[PDB]
């Protein structure tokens, strides 16, 4: 209920329909900025953040108390400020804005481990954190084949699945 559906297909290209009917994307062929406070009157669909493991995040009064509108109020936001999470919350986030663009955030880049420099769902080049809206945010990764992997973030053993070309 706390997901923000402010979607708007003003070019009639068909993306917003893909949110509801998956796997129908037409291939034919085909860094991140610091997280923060995003106006939910901008985001379309589930917002995800990656620990690297993925988790949906909800709307919120800037005071921090969760706000249960559907991005309706401008007093309704996604609070996303992150810290690299052995200790913190999540490496980075990704979502779709109102006119259909994939947006992402994360901690600042930089021996080049995910635990030290990871800024979202990207991990290594080619391998990407799989999640039930990957084909929607990163659609060109439809050929990517999805292996079971495990990673350690400063000692913690994590099980997840990575889509890779």
């Amino acid at each position, epitope marked *: 209920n706390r997901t923000a559906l402010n979607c708007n297909d003003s070019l009639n290209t068909g993306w917003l329909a893909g949110l509801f009917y998956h796997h129908k994307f037409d291939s034919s062929g085909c860094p991140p900025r610091p997280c923060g406070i995003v106006p939910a009157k901008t985001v379309c669909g589930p917002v995800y953040c990656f620990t690297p493991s993925p988790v949906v995040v909800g709307t919120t009064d800037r005071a921090g108390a969760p706000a249960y509108n559907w991005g309706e109020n401008d007093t309704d936001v996604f609070v996303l*400020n992150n*810290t*690299r*999470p052995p*200790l*913190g*919350n999540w490496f980075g986030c990704t979502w779709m804005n109102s006119t259909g663009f994939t947006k992402a955030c994360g901690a600042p880049p930089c021996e080049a481990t995910y635990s030290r420099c990871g800024s979202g769902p990207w991990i290594t080049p080619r391998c990407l954190v799989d999640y039930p809206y990957r084909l929607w945010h990163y659609p060109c990764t439809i050929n990517y084949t999805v292996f079971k992997i495990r990673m350690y973030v400063g000692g913690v053993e994590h099980r997840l699945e990575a889509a890779c070309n």
Partner: antibody
Amino acid sequence: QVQLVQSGAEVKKPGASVKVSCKASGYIFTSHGISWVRQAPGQGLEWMGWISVYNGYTNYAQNLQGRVTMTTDTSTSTAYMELRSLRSDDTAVYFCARASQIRGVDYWGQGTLVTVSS
Amino acid sequence: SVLTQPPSASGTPGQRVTISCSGSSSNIGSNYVYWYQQFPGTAPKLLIYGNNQRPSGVPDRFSGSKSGTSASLAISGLRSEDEADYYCAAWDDSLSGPWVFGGGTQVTVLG
């Protein structure tokens, strides 16, 4: 600004469940993690563990033989440090502090002195 | 403990005293190193994060550096307002950590 208001100085003798609270404000409590460092008087600082407000990840220190139990309640923005089965050495000022992976443990509460003696 | 620094330091009005913190590969080697100021009967006040990065409040005066398994700070211009203890810390990727501190260095002025 960001601060951390620790609770008062409890005092009790050996074998005791202290539990100093540590109230956070001025940042997104869940964004960072927080730790604890005690300082028995005169000598230096002793890192004592840290916790995720978000994961629940806890790396307690080896010295404290599983006595510690850091714990938070995202509802109230309070963080806690229970330490059971107390003993003389445990007489120290017990601070909490925010902890980022890049900015270290950076902003510290005021202090909680806690004394054990017969 | 786990890290080591001289137990004291001395200085005169504006004599840029030095101070040293020394560990291994498992701490000072691959990780960042932070430095704290402790005035008696107060919580420690973080002075430098990363290795050379200073936060708000901290004057242009306090600065630092790192080389190999040695990280060392200079207090630059001296006002006795600086007379304090000074503790260093880094991460430690090993079991020796993941976080280690120094023994501190109380610093007095010669005046």
